[PDB]
């Protein structure tokens with residue numbers, strides 16, 4: 001089977017139209033049914049976005065089906081994505097907050113700073129002793145040590161690095177990027 | 180041409196991927212260019228959205244190109260959308276769009292002629308999410324709205340007067356005089 | 370003596386997983402919690418690690434009457450504006466409300482024109498939309514690469530202005546004095 | 556005497572197209588504008604039609620040092636939680652900062668289990684993610700159509716919780732006491 005068409009939730013499209021004081025009838029020739037409005041591919045949708053002066057993104061907001069189960073989502077140790085770089089392991093991830101990236105890390109250690117990022121970040125040390133380095137004010141390098149149970153908050157776009165303090169003793173941290 | 184095909188900005192996709200600590204290579208089955216990544220149709224994209232655990236919408240957030248020219252956009256009288264509004268078989272308003280822009284879709288600026296008055300039945304709306312400010316450019320305007328404890332309230336606005344309306348407060352503007360047709364400007368936003 | 374809405378303070382406390390009892394040195398009543406002035410409140414803001422501002426968000430009493438507020442022509446603030454000794458505008462407030470301090474709605478008479486020197490502003494954080502109610506308006510603004518641009522707006526025409534774009538409205542004709550509405554917001 | 560940052564006040568004034576001069580009876584210096592206590596400030600808030608909160612937004616001083624803040628085990632607030640008359644949790648604050656009051660990071664010991672009665676909370680505005688650092692955790696929550704649901708989380712498992720979803724974490728094994736990390740935010 002094959003579909004030539006793009007589907008958009010009708011209720012949603014109508015609601016967008018009403019923000020511009022319009023109704024379906026003010027669109028072109030579009031077929032609709034009881035739940036869906038159909039387009040001849042992306043380019044057709046873009047034109048309609050231009051006409052309504054609304055970013056394309058808006059036409060899908062809400063239209064992906066929640067990955068939750070009864071208001072909640074659960075992940076398991078090793079159940080998701082996992083990779084060597086650090087050893088990164090995804091914790092629970094959800095389409096109900098794409099801005100949220102929760103990680104577990106093993107540190108393999110010893111300088112390789114990142115470039116900072118748009119997310120705020122909080123890190124908690126679950127095991128061992130962690131060397132943290134970051135670029136402070138006036139681009140001066142700073143450092144400190146975090147022990148099991150200690151935590152740190154990091155402002156957006158502050159460059160940073162976590163390594164083992166001891167060397168050989170391999171530590172574990174949790175990192176939550178969000179907002 | 181290929182109407183099925185879906186394009187997604189590469190830089191954006193890459194950035195999304197790096198939020199999940201991935202790269203394009205982890206999507207084995209996609210063509211890309213220098214600027215674009217392409218998908219075989221919607222179903223392909225949905226699968227990828229699942230895999231990355233991100234709503235389909237995310238792939239386009241930010242990607243729309245500004246309709247401004249040098250930080251500004253200009254509209255002309257009658258240059259845009261325009262329409263009559265009839266509520267219960269009562270001709271109520273003529274809506275005219277003022278400037279509209281994709282840089283603030285939440286902004287709806289209107290010019291209105293009023294056609295109804297006290298001889299017609301009342302046709303409130305159901306309020307709306309937007310805040311609203313209205314200015315009277317011409318004539319004398321009857322404004323009615325549902326206040327506290329669902330009690331109906333009313334007042335009259337004259338040329339140069341103005342009113343702010345909290346979200347979801349139901350309201351109606353009509354001519355005070357009846358026959359004398361008034362004009363207002365309405366700005367919905369936020 | 371400082372009063373803070375109890376429901377609000379409690380709600381803030383619960384964000385830090387606390388309750389009133391964890392502030393040992395405060396009297397409360399059914400609706401209000403009381404402090405020994407600002408300095409006492411600042412210490413508590415420190416303790417909760419919350420900006421002082423938060424303790425008042427929502428607490429100013431609405432200036433609306435039944436979900437609405439009304440202003441009258443000439444009823445509010447009004448003022449002349451003179452830039453470099455050039456009479457440029459007459460600003461008149463339209464309705465203003467503490468339920469959206471970010472909203473500044475104005476009516477303006479234009480006094481300047483092309484015979485006067487140009488007096489741009491520095492742009493501003495607010496988005497702005499302008500509608501011409503009367504006459505013909507010369508609009509100038511700094512575009513991309515800091516290049517000056519210009520156009521003319523007639524009765525009924527409108528314009529949207531991105532934040533921090535510097536701009537100026539003047540009469541196109543000179544002597545013929547125009548009127549516009551300007552809405553700054555968000 | 557109340558102090559308000561001059562630059563901030565000026566900026567607020569310019570949103571209403573005003574300047575300091577338009578304030579009846581205020582002293583200023585180079586950095587500060589001064590009021591005769593809160594009531595004076597409230598009147599000015601009325602005059603400008605701006606909530607009182609606005610006069611402090613931004614004005615709390617950052618608790619960060621070089622873009623970062625660090626907390627230590629037991630270094631901050633800590634407390635027992637008793638619901639009905641069942642010892643349920645030991646809350647410990649992790650790093651907290653006035654640069655994101657919406658962020659509440661916690662470490663918890665669990666004391667209750669299936670022999671105790673169930674003590675759900677009422678959900679909350681924050682999103683929440685929880686990670687199990689130690690033991691085995693019984694998690695119960697109110698799902699769709701108000702139906703109670705349950706599952707078990709083991710060391711290293713995690714869970715996301717939508718706003719205002721009511722929930723409870725207890726020990727799966729009575730007596731074996733588990734530990735979790737909870738991050739409320741946004």
Ligand SMILES: C[C@H](O)CP(=O)(O)O
Nearest residue numbers: 304307311350352365
């Ligand atoms: C002037 C009114 O607010 C227009 P409506 O919101 O009823 O579409």
Ligand SMILES: C[C@H](O)CP(=O)(O)O
Nearest residue numbers: 490497536537538551
């Ligand atoms: C309508 C104009 O934008 C007024 P200004 O911003 O120059 O105060």
Ligand SMILES: [Fe+3]
Nearest residue numbers: 114121160175
């Ligand atoms: Fe990181």
Ligand SMILES: [Fe+3]
Nearest residue numbers: 307311350365
């Ligand atoms: Fe309206």
Ligand SMILES: [Fe+3]
Nearest residue numbers: 493497551553
């Ligand atoms: Fe302006």
Ligand SMILES: [Fe+3]
Nearest residue numbers: 676683722737
């Ligand atoms: Fe909770």
